[PDB]
């Protein structure tokens, strides 16, 4: 899944 | 999961060199890509983060470029303390995985191994086991590979090798490689052959014995 | 400055848990956004992801690891703990732990997520060896040579354990032409480790060798004569 600070 | 690849995996340089490693990613990570120097013995040491900046207190000869699934890291004037291993690491997705890195190590002139066979000890066959030996001395680049056979039939999954770290005044590397037999299954074959091919070497070059024969 | 450093066993045996902890000072994982990662490097290997824990306690685990590693923190003692059960030969690596910037803020408000990625500062790093192995001195064996080219001989240091053990040649008289080779662990959680000395061939009839090996952890001080063979 993405990162913690993705998007 | 999100695959870094790093090209090349190993880089020959000089002091004062400029060099430039790669990391393309099988998925885009935008920028969430950081880059790192390990010094032999040493932990990781971040060089860049985001991609492209410059993590306080790394010299000014590192700089990083880059964005989606292609990054690259350059070093401006290659130092002494830069000839380690490098790795990029990802982290736009969960896991943050690393590259394979890329070792950097002084250049020098190719230089084909001397290459060693040692058959094993009647001390040792007394304790039931055979260990066979083949030693690659001061070569370079690195790459080298050993193949063992007996009898013709190609070893896999009982050896293992070790290799030294480059020569500080050699800037050559030398190889171990153990072939491990029982007694029994070493009293029953003859020919013992360790085959080394290497970039020094027009052709791959065998060393071999033949048990009992004295 | 911040600082962070492994403590744990260095010896576990296969089927056991492991359990390593990571202190640390100069952060508080109570600070917006800010997390403590495990990365673990195999010998000789590339580095591979573990897992990281951040200050709200969300955690990440490596799917190839997730079902035999806990990650935990204890924000009072600056401490983070990676718990690691059925351990198996193949863990035997080094541990790091990092610290991974969150956010940079102002006054208070997240202004740039660019910092959040790397893991910045990393700790030494502690060396976890897996095997069943029991404290066992190695067998040392000759590695019997051969004017014009070169002569090869050497000692083979073989089923030792653990960690380390020294070598030198003529107590330490004899250093050009000598290569001590990093030790492999068998597949028998024992070691084993060749140190060979390349010579001219005309002194393998004026000098004699010998490897001088010496196992502290087993009391085990071994002096072995290697001269070429066939008497």
Redesign the interface.
């Given at each position: 899944?993405?990162?913690k600070?993705?998007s | 999961?999100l695959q870094l690849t790093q090209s090349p995996s190993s880089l020959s340089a000089s002091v004062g060199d400029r060099i430039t490693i790669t990391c393309r990613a099988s998925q885009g990570v935008?920028?969430?890509?950081?880059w790192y120097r390990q010094k032999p013995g040493?932990?990781?040491?971040?060089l860049?983060?985001?991609?492209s900046?410059l993590?306080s207190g790394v010299p000014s000869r590192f700089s990083g470029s880059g964005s989606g699934t292609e990054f690259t890291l350059t070093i401006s004037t290659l130092r002494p303390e830069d000839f380690a291993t490098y790795?990029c690491?990802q982290?736009?997705?969960?896991?943050?995985?690393?590259?394979?890195?890329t070792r950097v190590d002084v250049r020098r002139t190719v230089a084909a191994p001397?290459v060693?066979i040692?058959?094993?000890?009647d001390?040792?066959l007394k304790?039931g086991t055979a260990?066979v030996?083949c030693?690659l001395?001061?070569f370079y680049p690195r790459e080298a590979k050993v193949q063992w056979k007996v009898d013709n039939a190609l070893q896999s999954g009982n050896s293992?090798?070790?290799?030294?770290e480059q020569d500080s005044k050699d800037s050559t590397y030398?190889?171990?490689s153990?072939l491990?037999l029982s007694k029994a299954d070493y009293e029953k074959h003859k020919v013992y052959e360790c085959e080394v091919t290497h970039q020094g070497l027009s052709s791959p070059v065998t060393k071999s014995f033949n048990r009992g024969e004295? | 400055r911040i600082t962070l450093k492994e403590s744990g066993p260095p010896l576990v045996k296969p089927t056991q848990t492991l359990t390593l902890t990571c202190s640390f000072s100069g952060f508080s994982l109570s600070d917006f956004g800010v997390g403590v990662?495990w990365?673990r490097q195999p010998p000789g290997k590339?580095?591979?992801?573990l897992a990281?824990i951040y200050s709200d306690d969300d955690k990440?685990?490596?799917?190839s690891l997730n079902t035999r590693l806990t990650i935990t923190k204890d924000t009072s003692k600056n401490q983070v703990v990676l718990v690691m059960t059925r351990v198996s030969p193949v863990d035997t690596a080094t541990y790091?732990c990092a610290h991974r910037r969150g956010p940079t803020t102002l006054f208070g408000v997240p202004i740039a997520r660019?910092?959040?990625?790397?893991?910045?500062?990393?700790?030494?790093?502690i060396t976890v060896t897996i095997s069943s192995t029991s404290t066992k001195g190695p067998?040392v064996?000759?590695?019997?040579?051969?004017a014009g080219?070169?002569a090869?001989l050497?000692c083979?240091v073989?089923d030792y354990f653990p960690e380390p053990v020294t070598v030198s040649w003529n107590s330490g008289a004899l250093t050009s032409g000598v290569?001590?080779?990093?030790?492999?662990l068998?597949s028998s959680g024992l070691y084993?480790?060749?140190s060979?000395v390349?010579v001219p061939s005309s002194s393998l009839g004026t000098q004699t060798y010998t490897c001088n090996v010496n196992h502290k952890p087993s009391n085990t001080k071994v002096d072995k004569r290697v001269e070429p063979k066939?008497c």
């Open positions: 899944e993405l990162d600070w993705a | 999961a935008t920028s969430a890509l950081a040493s932990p990781p040491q971040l860049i983060y985001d991609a900046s993590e790795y690491q982290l736009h997705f969960y896991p943050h995985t690393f590259g394979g890195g001397s060693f040692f058959p094993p000890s001390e040792q304790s260990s030996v030693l001395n001061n293992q090798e070790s290799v030294t030398s190889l171990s153990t491990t004295c | 990662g990365i590339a580095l591979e992801w990281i990440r685990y490596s799917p790091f660019g910092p959040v990625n790397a893991m910045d500062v990393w700790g030494q790093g067998s064996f000759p590695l019997a040579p051969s080219g070169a090869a050497g083979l073989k290569h001590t080779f990093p030790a492999v068998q084993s480790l060749s060979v390349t066939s």
